[PDB]
Coordinates of C-alpha atoms in Angstrom, one line a residue:
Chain A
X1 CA 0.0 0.0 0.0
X2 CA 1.2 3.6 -0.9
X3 CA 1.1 6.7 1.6
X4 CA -0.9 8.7 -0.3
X5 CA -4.7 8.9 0.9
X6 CA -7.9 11.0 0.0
X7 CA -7.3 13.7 2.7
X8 CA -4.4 14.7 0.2
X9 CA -6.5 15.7 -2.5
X10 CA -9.6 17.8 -2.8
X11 CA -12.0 19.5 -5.4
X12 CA -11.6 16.0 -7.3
X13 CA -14.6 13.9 -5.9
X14 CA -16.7 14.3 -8.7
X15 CA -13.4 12.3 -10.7
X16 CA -13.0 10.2 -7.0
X17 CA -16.3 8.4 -7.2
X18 CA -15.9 7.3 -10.5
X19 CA -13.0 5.6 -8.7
X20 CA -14.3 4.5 -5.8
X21 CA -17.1 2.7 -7.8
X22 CA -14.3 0.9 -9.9
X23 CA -11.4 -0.6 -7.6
X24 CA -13.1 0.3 -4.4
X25 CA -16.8 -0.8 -3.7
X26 CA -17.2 -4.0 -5.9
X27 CA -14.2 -4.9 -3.5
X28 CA -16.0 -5.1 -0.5
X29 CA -19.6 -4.9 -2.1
X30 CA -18.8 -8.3 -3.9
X31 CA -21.0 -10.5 -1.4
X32 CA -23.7 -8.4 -2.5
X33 CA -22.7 -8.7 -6.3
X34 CA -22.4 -12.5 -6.0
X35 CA -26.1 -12.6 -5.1
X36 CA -27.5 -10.3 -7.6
X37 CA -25.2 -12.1 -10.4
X38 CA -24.3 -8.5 -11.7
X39 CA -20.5 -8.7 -12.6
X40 CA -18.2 -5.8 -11.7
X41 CA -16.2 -3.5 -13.9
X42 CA -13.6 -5.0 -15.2
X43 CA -11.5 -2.0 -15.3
X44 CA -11.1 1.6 -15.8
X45 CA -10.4 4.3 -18.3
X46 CA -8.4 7.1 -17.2
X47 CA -7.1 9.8 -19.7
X48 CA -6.8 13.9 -20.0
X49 CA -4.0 16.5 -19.7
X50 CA -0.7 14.7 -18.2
X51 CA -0.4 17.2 -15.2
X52 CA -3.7 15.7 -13.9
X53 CA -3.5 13.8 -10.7
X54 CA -4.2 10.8 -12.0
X55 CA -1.2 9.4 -10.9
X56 CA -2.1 10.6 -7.3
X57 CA -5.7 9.5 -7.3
X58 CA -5.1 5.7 -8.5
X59 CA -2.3 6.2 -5.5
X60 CA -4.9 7.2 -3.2
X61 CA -7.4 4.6 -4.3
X62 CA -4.9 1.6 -3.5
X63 CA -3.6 2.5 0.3
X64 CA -7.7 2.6 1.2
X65 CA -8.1 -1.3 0.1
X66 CA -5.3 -2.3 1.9
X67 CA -4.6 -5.2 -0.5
X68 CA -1.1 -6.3 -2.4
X69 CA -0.5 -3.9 -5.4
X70 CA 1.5 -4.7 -9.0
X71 CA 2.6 -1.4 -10.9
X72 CA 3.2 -2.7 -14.6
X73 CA 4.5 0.0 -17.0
X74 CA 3.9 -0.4 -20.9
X75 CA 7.0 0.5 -22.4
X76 CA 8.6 -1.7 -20.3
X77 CA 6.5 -4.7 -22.2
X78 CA 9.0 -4.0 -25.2
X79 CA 12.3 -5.6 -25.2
X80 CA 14.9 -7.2 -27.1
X81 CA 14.4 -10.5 -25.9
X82 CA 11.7 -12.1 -27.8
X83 CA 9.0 -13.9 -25.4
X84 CA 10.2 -11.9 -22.7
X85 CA 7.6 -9.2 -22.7
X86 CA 5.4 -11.6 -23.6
X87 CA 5.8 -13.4 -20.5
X88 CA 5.5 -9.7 -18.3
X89 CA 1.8 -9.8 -18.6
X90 CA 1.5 -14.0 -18.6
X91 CA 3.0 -13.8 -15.3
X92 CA 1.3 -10.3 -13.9
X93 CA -2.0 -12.3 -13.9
X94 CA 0.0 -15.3 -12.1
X95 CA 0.8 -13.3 -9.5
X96 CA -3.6 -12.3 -8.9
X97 CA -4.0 -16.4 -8.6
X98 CA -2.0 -16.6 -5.8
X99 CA -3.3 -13.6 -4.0
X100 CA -6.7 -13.3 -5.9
X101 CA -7.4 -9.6 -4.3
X102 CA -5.3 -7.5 -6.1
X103 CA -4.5 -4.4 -7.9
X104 CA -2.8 -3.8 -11.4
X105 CA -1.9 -0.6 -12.9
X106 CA -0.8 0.2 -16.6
X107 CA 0.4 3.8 -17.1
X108 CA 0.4 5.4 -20.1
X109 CA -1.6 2.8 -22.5
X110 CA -1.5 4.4 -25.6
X111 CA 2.5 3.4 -25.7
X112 CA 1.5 -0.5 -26.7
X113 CA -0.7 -0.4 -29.9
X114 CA -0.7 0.4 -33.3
X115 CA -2.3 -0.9 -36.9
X116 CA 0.4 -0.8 -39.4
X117 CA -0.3 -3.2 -41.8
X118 CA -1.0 -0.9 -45.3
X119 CA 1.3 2.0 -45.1
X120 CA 5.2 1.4 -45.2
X121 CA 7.7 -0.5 -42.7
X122 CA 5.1 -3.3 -42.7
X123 CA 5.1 -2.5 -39.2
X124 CA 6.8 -3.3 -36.1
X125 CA 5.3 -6.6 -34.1
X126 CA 7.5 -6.4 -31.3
X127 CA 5.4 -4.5 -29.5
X128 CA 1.9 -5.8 -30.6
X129 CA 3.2 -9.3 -29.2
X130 CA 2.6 -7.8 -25.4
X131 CA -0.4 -6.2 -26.2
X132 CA -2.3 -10.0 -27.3
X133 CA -1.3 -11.0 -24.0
X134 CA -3.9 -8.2 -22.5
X135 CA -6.4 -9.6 -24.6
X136 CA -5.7 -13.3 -23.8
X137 CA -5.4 -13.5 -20.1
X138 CA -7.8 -11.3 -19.7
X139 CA -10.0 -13.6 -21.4
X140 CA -8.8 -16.4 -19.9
X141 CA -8.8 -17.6 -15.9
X142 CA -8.5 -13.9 -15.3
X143 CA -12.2 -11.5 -15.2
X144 CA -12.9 -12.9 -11.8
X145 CA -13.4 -8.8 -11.1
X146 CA -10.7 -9.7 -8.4
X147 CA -8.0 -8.5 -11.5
X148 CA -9.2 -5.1 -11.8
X149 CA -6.5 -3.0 -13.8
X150 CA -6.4 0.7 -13.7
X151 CA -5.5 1.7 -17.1
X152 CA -3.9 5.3 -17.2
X153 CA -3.2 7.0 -20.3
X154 CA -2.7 10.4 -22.1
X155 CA -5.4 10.8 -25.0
X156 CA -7.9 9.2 -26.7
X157 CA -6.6 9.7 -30.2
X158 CA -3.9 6.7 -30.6
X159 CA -4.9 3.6 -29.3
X160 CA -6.2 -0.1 -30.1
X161 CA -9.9 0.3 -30.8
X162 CA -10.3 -3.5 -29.6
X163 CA -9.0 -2.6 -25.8
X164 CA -12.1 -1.1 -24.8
X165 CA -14.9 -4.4 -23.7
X166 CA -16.9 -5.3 -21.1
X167 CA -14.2 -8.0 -19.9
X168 CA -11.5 -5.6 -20.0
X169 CA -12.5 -1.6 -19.3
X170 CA -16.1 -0.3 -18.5
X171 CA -16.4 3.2 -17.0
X172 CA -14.4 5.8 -19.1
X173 CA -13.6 8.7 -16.5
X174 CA -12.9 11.6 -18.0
Chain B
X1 CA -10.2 -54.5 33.6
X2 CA -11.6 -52.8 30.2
X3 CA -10.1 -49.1 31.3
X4 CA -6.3 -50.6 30.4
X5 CA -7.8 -52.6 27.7
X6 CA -9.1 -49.4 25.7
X7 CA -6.1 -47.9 25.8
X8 CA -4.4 -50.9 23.9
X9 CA -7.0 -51.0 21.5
X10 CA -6.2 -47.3 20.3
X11 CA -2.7 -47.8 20.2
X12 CA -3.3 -50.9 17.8
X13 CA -5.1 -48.5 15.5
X14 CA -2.4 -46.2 15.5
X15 CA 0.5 -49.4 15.1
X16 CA -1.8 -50.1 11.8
X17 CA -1.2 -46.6 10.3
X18 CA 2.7 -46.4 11.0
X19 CA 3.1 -50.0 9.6
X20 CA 2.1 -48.1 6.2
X21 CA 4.0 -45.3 7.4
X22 CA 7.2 -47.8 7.3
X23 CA 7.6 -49.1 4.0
X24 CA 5.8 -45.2 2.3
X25 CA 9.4 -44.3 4.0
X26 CA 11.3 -47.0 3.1
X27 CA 10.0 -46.8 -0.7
X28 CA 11.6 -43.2 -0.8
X29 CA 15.3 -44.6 -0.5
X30 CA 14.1 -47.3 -3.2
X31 CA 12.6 -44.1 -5.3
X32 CA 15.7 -42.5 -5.3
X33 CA 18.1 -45.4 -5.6
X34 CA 16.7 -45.1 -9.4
X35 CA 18.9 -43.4 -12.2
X36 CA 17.9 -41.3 -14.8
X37 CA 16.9 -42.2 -18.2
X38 CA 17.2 -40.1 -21.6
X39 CA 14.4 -40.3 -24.4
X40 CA 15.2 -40.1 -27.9
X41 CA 13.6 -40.5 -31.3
X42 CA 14.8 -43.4 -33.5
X43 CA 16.2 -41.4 -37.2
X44 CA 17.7 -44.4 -38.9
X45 CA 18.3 -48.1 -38.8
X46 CA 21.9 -48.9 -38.9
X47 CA 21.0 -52.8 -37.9
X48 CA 19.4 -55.4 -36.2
X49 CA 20.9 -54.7 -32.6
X50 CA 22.9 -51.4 -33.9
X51 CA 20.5 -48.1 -34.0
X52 CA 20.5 -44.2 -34.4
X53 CA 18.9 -42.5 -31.6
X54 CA 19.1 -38.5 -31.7
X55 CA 19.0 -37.1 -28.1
X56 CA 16.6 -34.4 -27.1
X57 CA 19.9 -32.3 -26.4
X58 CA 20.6 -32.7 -30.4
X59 CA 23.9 -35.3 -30.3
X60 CA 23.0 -38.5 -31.8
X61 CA 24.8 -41.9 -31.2
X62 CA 24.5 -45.1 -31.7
X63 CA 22.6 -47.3 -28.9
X64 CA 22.2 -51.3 -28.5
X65 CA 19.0 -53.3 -27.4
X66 CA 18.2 -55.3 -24.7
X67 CA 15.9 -58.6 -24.3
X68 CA 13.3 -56.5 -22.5
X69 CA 12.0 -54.7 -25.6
X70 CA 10.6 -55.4 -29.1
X71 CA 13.0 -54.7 -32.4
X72 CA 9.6 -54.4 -34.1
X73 CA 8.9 -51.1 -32.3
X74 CA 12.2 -49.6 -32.3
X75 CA 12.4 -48.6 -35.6
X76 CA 12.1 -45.0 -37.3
X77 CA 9.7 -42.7 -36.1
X78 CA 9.1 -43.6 -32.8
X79 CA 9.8 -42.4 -29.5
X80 CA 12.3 -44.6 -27.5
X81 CA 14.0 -44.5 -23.9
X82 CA 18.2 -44.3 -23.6
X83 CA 20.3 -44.6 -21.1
X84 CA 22.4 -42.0 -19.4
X85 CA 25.7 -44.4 -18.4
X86 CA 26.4 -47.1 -21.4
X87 CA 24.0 -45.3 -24.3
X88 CA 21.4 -48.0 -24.8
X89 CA 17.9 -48.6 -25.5
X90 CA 16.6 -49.8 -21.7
X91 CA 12.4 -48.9 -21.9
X92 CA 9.8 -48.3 -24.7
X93 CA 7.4 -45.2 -24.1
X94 CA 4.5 -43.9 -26.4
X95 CA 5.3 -41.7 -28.2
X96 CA 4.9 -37.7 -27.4
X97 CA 7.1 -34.7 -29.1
X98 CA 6.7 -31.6 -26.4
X99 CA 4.9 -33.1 -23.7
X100 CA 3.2 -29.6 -23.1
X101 CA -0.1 -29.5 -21.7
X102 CA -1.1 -26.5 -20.8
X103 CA -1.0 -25.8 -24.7
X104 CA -2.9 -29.3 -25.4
X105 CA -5.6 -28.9 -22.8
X106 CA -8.1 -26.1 -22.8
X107 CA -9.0 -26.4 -19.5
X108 CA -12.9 -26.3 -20.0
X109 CA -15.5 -25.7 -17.9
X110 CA -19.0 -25.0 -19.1
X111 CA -20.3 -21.7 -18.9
X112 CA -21.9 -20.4 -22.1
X113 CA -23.6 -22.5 -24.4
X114 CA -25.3 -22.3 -27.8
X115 CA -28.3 -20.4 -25.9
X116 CA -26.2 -18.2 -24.4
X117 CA -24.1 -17.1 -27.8
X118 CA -28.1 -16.5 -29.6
X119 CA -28.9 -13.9 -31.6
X120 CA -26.0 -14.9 -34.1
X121 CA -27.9 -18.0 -34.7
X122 CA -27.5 -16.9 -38.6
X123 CA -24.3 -17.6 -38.6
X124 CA -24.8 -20.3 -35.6
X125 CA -25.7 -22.9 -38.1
X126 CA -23.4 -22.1 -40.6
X127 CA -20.4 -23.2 -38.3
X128 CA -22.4 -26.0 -37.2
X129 CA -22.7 -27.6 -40.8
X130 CA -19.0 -27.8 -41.2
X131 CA -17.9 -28.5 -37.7
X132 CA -20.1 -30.6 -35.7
X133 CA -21.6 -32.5 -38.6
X134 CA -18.3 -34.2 -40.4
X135 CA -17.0 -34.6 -36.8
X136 CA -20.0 -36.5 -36.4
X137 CA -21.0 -37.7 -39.6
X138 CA -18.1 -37.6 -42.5
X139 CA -19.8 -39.6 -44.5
X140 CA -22.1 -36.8 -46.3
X141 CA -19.2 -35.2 -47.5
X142 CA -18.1 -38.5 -48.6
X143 CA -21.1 -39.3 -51.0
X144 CA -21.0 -36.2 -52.6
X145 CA -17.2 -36.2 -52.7
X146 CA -16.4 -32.6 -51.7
X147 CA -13.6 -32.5 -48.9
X148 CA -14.4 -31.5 -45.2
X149 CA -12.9 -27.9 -44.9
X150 CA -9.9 -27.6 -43.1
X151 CA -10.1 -23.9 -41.2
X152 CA -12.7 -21.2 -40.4
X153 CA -11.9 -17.8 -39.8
X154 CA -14.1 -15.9 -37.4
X155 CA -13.7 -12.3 -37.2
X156 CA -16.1 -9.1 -36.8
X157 CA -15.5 -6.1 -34.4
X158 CA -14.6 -6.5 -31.2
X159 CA -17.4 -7.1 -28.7
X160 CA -19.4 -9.2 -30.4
X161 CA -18.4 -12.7 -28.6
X162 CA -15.5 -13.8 -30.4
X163 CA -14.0 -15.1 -27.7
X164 CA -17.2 -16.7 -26.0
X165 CA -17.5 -18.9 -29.7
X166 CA -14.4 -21.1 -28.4
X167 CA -16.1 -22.0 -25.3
X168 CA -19.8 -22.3 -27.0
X169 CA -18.3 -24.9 -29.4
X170 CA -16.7 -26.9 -27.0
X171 CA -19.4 -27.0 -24.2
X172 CA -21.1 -29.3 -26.8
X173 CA -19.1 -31.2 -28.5
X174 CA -16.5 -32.2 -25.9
X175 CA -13.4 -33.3 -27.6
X176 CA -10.0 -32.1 -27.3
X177 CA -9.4 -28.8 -27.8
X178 CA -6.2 -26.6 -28.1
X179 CA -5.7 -23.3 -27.8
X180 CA -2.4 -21.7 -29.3
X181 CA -2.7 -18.0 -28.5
X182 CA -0.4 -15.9 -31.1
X183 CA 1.9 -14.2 -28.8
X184 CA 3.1 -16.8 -26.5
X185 CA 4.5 -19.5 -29.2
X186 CA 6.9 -17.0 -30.1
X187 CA 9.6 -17.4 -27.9
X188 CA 12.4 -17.2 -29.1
X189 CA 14.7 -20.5 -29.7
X190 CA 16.4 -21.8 -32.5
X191 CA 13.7 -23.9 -34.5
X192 CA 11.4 -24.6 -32.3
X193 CA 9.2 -21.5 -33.3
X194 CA 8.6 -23.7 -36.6
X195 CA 8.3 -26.7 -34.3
X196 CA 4.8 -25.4 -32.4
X197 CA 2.9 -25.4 -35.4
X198 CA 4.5 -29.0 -36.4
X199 CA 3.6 -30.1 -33.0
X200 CA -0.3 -29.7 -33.1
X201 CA -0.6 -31.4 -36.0
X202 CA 1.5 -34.1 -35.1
X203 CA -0.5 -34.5 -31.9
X204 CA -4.0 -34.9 -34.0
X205 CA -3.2 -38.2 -35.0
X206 CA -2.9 -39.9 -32.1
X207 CA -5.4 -37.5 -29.8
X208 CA -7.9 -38.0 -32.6
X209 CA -8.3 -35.1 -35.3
X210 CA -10.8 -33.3 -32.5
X211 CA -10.3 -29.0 -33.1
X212 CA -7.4 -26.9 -33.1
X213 CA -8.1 -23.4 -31.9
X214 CA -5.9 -20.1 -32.8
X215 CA -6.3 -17.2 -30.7
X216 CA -6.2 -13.5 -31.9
X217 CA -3.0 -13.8 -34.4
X218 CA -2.0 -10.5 -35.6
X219 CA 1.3 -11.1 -36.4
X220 CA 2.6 -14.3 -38.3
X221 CA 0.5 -13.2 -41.1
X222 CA 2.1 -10.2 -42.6
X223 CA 4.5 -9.6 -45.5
X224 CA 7.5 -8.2 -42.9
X225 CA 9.4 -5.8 -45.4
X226 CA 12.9 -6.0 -44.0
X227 CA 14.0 -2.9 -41.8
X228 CA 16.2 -5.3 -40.1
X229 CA 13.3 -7.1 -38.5
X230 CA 14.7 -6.7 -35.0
X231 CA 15.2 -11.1 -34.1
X232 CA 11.7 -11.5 -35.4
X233 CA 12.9 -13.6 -38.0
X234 CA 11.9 -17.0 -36.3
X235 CA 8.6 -15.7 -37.2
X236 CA 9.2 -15.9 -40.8
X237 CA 9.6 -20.1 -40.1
X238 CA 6.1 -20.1 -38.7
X239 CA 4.6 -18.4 -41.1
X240 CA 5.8 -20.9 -43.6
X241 CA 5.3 -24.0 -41.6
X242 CA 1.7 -22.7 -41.6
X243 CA 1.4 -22.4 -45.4
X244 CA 3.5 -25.9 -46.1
X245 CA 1.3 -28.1 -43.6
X246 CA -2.0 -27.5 -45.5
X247 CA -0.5 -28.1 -48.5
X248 CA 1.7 -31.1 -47.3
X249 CA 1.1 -34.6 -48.2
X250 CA -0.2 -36.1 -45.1
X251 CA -3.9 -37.1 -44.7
X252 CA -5.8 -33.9 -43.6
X253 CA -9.1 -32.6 -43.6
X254 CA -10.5 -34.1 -40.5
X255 CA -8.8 -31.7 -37.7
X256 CA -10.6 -28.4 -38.0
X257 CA -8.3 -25.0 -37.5
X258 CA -10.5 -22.2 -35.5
X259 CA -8.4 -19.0 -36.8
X260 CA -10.1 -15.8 -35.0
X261 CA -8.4 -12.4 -35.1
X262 CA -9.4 -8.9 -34.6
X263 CA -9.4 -8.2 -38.6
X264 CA -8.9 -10.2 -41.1
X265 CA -6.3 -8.0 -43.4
X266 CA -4.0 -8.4 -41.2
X267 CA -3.5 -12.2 -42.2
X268 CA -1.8 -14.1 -44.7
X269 CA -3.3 -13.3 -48.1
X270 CA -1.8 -16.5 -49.1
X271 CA -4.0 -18.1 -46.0
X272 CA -7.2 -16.5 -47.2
X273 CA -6.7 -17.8 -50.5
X274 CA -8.7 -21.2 -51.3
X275 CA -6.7 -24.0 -50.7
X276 CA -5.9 -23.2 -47.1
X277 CA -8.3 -21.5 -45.8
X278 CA -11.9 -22.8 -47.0
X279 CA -14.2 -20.9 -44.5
X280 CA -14.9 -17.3 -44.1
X281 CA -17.3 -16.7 -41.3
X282 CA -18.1 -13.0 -40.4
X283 CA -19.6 -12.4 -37.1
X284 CA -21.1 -8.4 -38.1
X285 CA -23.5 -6.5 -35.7
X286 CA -27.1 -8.7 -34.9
X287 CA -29.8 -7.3 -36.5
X288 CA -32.9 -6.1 -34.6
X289 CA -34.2 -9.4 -33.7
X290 CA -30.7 -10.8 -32.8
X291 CA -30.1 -8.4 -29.4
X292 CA -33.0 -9.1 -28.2
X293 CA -32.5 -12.9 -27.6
X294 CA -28.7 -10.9 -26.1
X295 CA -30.7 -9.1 -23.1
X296 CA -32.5 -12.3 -21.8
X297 CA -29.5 -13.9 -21.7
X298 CA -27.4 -11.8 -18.9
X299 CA -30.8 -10.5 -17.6
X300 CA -31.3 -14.6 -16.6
X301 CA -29.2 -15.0 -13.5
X302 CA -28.8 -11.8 -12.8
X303 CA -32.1 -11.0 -10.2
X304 CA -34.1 -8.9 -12.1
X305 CA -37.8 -7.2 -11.9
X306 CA -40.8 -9.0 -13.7
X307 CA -41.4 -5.4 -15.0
X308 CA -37.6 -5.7 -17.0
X309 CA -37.4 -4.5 -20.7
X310 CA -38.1 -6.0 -23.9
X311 CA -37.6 -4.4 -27.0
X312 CA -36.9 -0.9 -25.8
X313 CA -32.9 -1.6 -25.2
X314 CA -32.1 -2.5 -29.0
X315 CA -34.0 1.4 -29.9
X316 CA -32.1 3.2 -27.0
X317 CA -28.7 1.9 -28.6
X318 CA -28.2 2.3 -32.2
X319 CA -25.3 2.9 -33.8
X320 CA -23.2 3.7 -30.3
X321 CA -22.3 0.4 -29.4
X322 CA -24.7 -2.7 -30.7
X323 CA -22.2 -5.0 -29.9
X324 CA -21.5 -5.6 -26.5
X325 CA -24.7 -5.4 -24.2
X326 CA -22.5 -6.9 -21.2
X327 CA -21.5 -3.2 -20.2
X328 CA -25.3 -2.4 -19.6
X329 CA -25.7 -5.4 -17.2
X330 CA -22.8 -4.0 -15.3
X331 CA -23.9 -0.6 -14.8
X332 CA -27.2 -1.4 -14.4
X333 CA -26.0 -2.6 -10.6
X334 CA -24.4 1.3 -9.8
X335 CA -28.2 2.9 -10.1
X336 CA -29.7 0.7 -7.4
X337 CA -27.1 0.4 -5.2
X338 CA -27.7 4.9 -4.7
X339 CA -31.3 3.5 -4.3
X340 CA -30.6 1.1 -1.7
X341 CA -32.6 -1.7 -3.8
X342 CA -31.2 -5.0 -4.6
X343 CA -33.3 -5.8 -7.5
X344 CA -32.5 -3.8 -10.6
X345 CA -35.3 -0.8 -11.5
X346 CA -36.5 -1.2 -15.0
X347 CA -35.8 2.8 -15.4
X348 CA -32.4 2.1 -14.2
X349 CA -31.9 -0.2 -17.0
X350 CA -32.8 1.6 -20.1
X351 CA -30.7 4.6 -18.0
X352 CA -27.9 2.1 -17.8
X353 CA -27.9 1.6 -22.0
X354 CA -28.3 5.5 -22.6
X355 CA -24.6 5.5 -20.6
X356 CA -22.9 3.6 -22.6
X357 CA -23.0 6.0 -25.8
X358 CA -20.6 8.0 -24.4
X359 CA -18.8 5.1 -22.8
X360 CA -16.8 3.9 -26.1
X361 CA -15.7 6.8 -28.3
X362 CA -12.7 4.4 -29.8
X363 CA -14.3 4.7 -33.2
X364 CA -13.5 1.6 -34.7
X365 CA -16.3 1.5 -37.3
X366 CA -16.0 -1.6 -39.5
X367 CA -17.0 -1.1 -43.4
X368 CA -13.6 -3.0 -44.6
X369 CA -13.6 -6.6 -43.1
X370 CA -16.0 -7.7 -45.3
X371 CA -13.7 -9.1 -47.6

């Protein structure tokens, strides 16, 4: 757990319940989820201006639960070892089997995706390689809505139109 | 008299369970007083008692036989056991290539069925025709004479239950299924990036031709223009023992390749060509009368009002979304818990749909996947 809590921070409620409703209450509202059969967010969407404090609300949001926390970055899915990015996000879900209460965060998600296949260079692929791992695992044992990710990124411009589902990101917070 | 007596009588219960306590600790020593033993594939046959066994490090030598196993097995092509101390054949195994399970079993457990994948039930009995019917029945395509297609491609937008038509298909049939996601067969190692692909298909025979299932590939299937490629290079190998195997000599046609990806372009155009791939099936947006079949589905477990909507969802969301109604069931549950209400108000679901409009906003508007 960080240091950072919600006495830090104010003006930002209307943005904080957005996150409260995502990592926080399906946490310990689950009993009540598991007998309504209504299945929790999978995630959310965080994007704006970089010199928001989004970096210090998704802080503030993990010391409350009091549960273990993984900080994954995205460029660091990229490297010269093939497999070996691949394997960062295979075994970042490992680690929320184990300890099934949990809390993932991705900063800056616009830096894995692309298209490329038209235009020129035919591309890249060692970077798409890590971003079908997202869409695997969490399509696989994972979406138990004890995997919650918080997804941080910059804009909405660039990015992977097929990272946005129900099993992966629900509430966009602007 | 019987106080003393008692107390024996436990004790004899208790001499019972450390009798099989003795030799469970006495077969440890024995389990470790065994060696080791290295497997190896028989290449060639130099002679009767003199063979040519290469070792799963990659040296071959030349190993003798014993009087414990058959000559008639030990020939070419099958898997045999070596020693590790005077190089010679000592046991016979069956035979297995990359005894990796996690990539042969799909670890099922039944969730969604047919039912629960309705509303596509257009395209529903298309796959049906060519996947459960010559797994069942081969001998229609036989009297006709028409080969049983090899792959299908499903693709469509994402949202639409791609990913729930792998788990549909096999809470039915209940074969063997294997699923080989794109990204985590490319490690990289000399040869054996070309050896996955060969694996599967070597597996089929003996497992029975069941399905083969390909997860989201994006990558094997372009043209890779060189700028130096960056290692990825062993993915040139599987692209082309992809191509060669459908075209290869062996008996093919019963294992059926499940090849789904986020758009199709993106694959080998020598793949969508005939002759490899036979089966385009395009999962597009349900029509009117497909969502509605949708809401009753997640509106089923979930605890619900009698007074819950019909065919007012599918006119609330049009052209926002029409894909994915999962994300209404989910914020369906925020609007009564600000109620305090543990069944879900009817209002509160149509309220739930209008949100999701401005939920997406990633574009992605599919004209060009057709083909």
């Amino acid at each position: 757990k960080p240091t950072e809590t919600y006495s830090d921070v104010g003006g930002l409620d209307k943005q904080i319940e957005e996150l409260v409703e995502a990592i926080v209450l399906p946490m310990k509202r689950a009993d009540k989820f598991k007998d309504m059969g209504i299945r929790a967010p999978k995630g959310a969407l965080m994007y704006g201006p970089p010199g928001t404090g989004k970096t210090l609300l998704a802080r503030a949001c993990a010391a409350q639960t009091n549960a273990t926390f993984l900080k994954l970055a995205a460029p660091q899915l990229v490297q010269m070892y093939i497999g070996e990015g691949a394997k960062l996000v295979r075994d970042a879900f490992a680690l929320a089997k184990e300890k099934a209460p949990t809390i993932i965060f991705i900063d800056e998600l616009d830096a894995i995706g692309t298209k490329r296949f038209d235009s020129e260079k035919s591309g890249d692929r060692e970077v798409q390689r890590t971003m079908l791992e997202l869409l695997n695992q969490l399509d696989g044992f994972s979406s138990d809505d004890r995997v919650k990710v918080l997804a941080a990124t910059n804009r909405v411009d660039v990015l992977d139109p097929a990272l946005l589902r129900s099993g992966r990101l629900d509430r966009k917070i602007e | 008299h019987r106080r003393y007596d008692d107390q024996l009588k436990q004790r004899r219960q208790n001499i019972r369970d450390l009798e099989k306590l003795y030799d469970k600790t006495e077969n440890d020593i024995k389990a470790l007083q065994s060696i080791g033993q290295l497997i190896g594939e028989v290449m060639k046959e130099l002679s009767e008692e003199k063979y040519i066994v290469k070792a799963s490090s990659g040296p071959r030598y030349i190993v003798g036989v014993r009087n414990s196993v058959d000559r008639s097995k030990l020939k070419k092509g099958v898997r045999v056991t070596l020693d590790i101390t005077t190089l010679t054949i000592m046991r016979i195994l069956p035979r297995e290539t990359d005894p990796l399970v996690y990539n042969m079993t799909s670890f099922e457990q039944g969730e969604i069925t047919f039912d629960g994948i309705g509303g596509l039930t257009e395209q529903i009995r298309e796959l049906r025709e060519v996947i459960e019917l010559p797994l069942k029945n081969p001998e229609i395509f036989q009297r006709v004479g028409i080969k049983p297609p090899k792959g299908v491609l499903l693709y469509g937008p994402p949202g639409t239950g791609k990913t729930l038509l792998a788990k549909a298909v096999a809470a039915t049939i209940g074969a063997n299924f294997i699923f080989s996601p794109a990204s985590g067969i490319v490690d990289k190692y000399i040869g054996e990036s070309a050896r996955i692909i060969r694996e599967m298909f070597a597996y089929a025979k003996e497992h029975e031709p069941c399905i083969i299932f390909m997860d989201e590939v994006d990558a094997i299937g372009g043209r890779r223009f060189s700028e130096g490629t960056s290692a990825d290079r062993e993915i040139q190998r599987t692209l082309m023992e992809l191509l060669t195997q459908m075209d290869g000599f062996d008996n093919l046609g019963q294992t059926k390749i499940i090849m789904a990806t986020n758009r199709p372009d993106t694959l080998d155009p020598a793949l969508l060509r005939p002759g490899r791939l036979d089966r385009k099936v395009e999962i597009p947006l349900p029509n009117e009368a497909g969502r509605l079949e949708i809401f009753k589905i997640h509106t089923a477990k979930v605890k619900k009002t009698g007074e819950f909507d019909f065919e007012a969802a599918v006119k609330m969301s049009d052209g926002f979304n029409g894909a994915d109604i999962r994300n209404c069931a989910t914020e369906a549950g925020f609007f009564a818990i600000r109620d305090d209400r543990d069944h879900i108000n009817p209002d509160d679901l149509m309220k739930a749909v209008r949100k999701v409009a401005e939920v997406k906003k990633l574009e992605g508007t599919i004209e060009y996947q057709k083909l």
